[PDB]
Design a protein around this ligand. Structure first.
Ligand SMILES: CN(Cc1ccccc1)C(=S)S
Ligand SMILES: [Zn+2]
Length: 257
């Protein structure tokens, strides 16, 4: 099965998922000097006040904090988006070292991790149908750098002991994802894909310019997770990121000058 190891990592994925070499794959490098400011891009609207988190799951390649997406409770709208996109889950990608871990890069700079807040277009009725559509998903990507702690992340860090291994889940209610957002909503946007198999080309990427800072202790706790199941040989869940893919026939747009 696919993974992030030597024999099943990103360079292998195309054998089971040929779209890996497609025309709108993610992540990409964001060349800040060639991104074009688009004055017609609307401000992003992030409406998370009624978000209802349900649980947290180690799925063998990341941990997902899952939300009730059966009503319009936590939605993303505006920006490059037409219509309303509902929050279904968030997860992170991170490194074995503070010098790598993000999937998008900024002028080739790698951050220590990257948060993906995953939303699906309500016109398609559920996530599974949405991923089959070119405008099915909107993923808000936020870079993490190591420095000061992010207090709003700590409840996530502290439950990771309970989901160390693949397939473990824990109740995780009343978590407020507003505590993971930077001050500014300035962003870059482009059409791309999921960054894990099945690599479907269904994502409008909205990548925030401003990173959040997390502490070294916080990211160290991410690195104690396991890719394996309980009772299987221990392999630390680190470097669960795909490298940058060719931009091909795409232009990254900026919401800011
Ligand atoms: C939705 N995904 C794929 C994914 C699903 C679960 C955990 C990690 C990644 C994107 S990378 S935004
Ligand atoms: Zn992701």
């Amino acid at each position: 099965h696919w993974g992030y190891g030597k024999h099943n990592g990103p360079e292998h994925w195309h054998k089971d998922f040929p779209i890996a070499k497609g025309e709108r794959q993610s992540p990409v490098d964001i060349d800040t000097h060639t991104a074009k400011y688009d004055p017609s891009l609307k401000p992003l609207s992030v409406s998370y006040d009624q978000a209802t988190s349900l649980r947290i799951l180690n799925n063998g390649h990341a941990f997902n904090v899952e939300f009730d997406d059966s009503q319009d409770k936590a939605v993303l709208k505006g920006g490059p988006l037409d219509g309303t996109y509902r929050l279904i889950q968030f997860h992170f990608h991170w490194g074995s070292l503070d010098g790598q871990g993000s999937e998008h890069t900024v002028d080739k700079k790698k951050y220590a991790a990257e948060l993906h807040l995953v939303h699906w277009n309500t016109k398609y009725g559920d996530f599974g149908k949405a991923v089959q559509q070119p405008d099915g998903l909107a993923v808000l990507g936020i870079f993490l750098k190591v420095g000061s702690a992010k207090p709003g992340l700590q409840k996530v860090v502290d439950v990771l002991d309970s989901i160390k291994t693949k397939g473990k889940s824990a109740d995780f209610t009343n978590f407020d994802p507003r505590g993971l957002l930077p001050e500014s909503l300035d962003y870059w946007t482009y059409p791309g894909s999921l960054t894990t198999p099945p690599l479907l080309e269904c994502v409008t990427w909205i990548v925030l310019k401003e990173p959040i800072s997390v502490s070294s202790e916080q990211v160290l706790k991410f690195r104690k997770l396991n890719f394996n199941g309980e009772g299987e040989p221990e392999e630390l869940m680190v470097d669960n990121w795909r490298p940058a893919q060719p931009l091909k026939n795409r232009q990254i747009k900026a919401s800011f000058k």
